[PDB]
Amino acid sequence: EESSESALSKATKWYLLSEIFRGLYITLEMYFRAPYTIYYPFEKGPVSPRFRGEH
Amino acid sequence: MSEVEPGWHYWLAYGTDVPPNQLKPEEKSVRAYPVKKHVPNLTYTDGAYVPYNTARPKCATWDPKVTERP
Ligand SMILES: CCCCCCCCCCCC(=O)OC[C@H](COP(=O)(O)OCC[N+](C)(C)C)OC(=O)CCCCCCCCCCC
Ligand SMILES: CCCCCCCCCCCC(=O)OC[C@H](COP(=O)(O)OCC[N+](C)(C)C)OC(=O)CCCCCCCCCCC
């Protein structure tokens, strides 16, 4: 009896999957963003003078 | 990837902003030995590195000699 949202309002979100479509929309946003992939071995990741490799 | 010369391997990996062809004369390495063409990794070939011991055996056997008794 102390809910802030009405039963119809809570049912509309529940039946129409309000947060599911919100999650789908965020995932679609990344589809139109630049990826992070680099093309090894044609490109190399960052290195520092302190890096330890072959002796 | 091993075909990249060690001079340009560091530049490709964003280790510096000065390419080896733009190096100052004092920043270059001084070699008293001659320089040959770059050799990549030689695995899966007949030129693969073969390890071996660089030290001689720690004991030497006696060279036998015969002396006749009087
Ligand atoms: C038209 C057919 C395609 C879309 C069908 C589904 C749409 C959502 C249905 C339920 C909405 C609802 O329940 O709305 C309510 C909710 C949340 O609002 P609240 O919490 O009440 O906000 C608080 C009160 N305010 C309003 C004053 C601030 O809204 C949503 O999360 C909307 C989702 C929008 C992003 C996804 C839209 C595109 C989906 C991907 C492409 C197919
Ligand atoms: C009259 C209009 C009819 C509408 C027809 C559609 C109804 C859909 C189902 C609504 C009920 C519901 O999703 O329920 C959620 C159920 C059961 O949840 P529960 O255990 O009851 O807890 C919730 C109830 N609370 C809050 C009172 C405790 O589980 C799920 O999370 C199911 C997730 C399915 C996700 C599939 C989405 C795939 C993508 C679709 C978009 C392209």
Side-chain angles (χ1 to χ4, degrees):
Chain A
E1 306 219 43
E2 294 161 327
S3 62
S4 60
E5 303 173 357
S6 61
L8 181 60
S9 298
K10 295 191 298 179
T12 309
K13 298 182 181 180
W14 186 67
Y15 269 103
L16 297 185
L17 315 173
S18 61
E19 78 291 328
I20 296 180
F21 284 104
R22 167 105 178 186
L24 289 165
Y25 199 89
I26 268 69
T27 309
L28 185 58
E29 293 183 356
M30 316 295 183
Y31 182 82
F32 301 94
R33 291 188 183 181
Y36 302 106
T37 308
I38 70 176
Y39 287 68
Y40 188 82
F42 298 88
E43 298 160 359
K44 254 241 177 181
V47 82
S48 69
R50 309 187 179 183
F51 187 83
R52 332 164 196 165
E54 193 180 22
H55 296 68
Chain B
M1 184 56 194
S2 60
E3 297 169 349
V4 179
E5 193 184 355
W8 297 84
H9 179 272
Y10 195 67
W11 177 88
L12 178 68
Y14 301 89
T16 179
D17 282 2
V18 177
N21 57 5
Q22 298 286 344
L23 276 177
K24 305 300 181 178
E26 60 276 16
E27 294 181 348
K28 289 186 177 183
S29 300
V30 179
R31 295 177 172 91
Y33 49 93
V35 195
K36 301 180 301 181
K37 190 190 176 182
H38 172 72
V39 181
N41 188 15
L42 295 174
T43 185
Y44 288 112
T45 56
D46 56 318
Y49 159 75
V50 180
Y52 56 90
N53 182 23
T54 65
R56 295 192 176 190
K58 299 181 180 181
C59 61
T61 191
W62 172 62
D63 192 10
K65 303 241 66 61
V66 176
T67 60
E68 283 71 15
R69 294 102 81 171

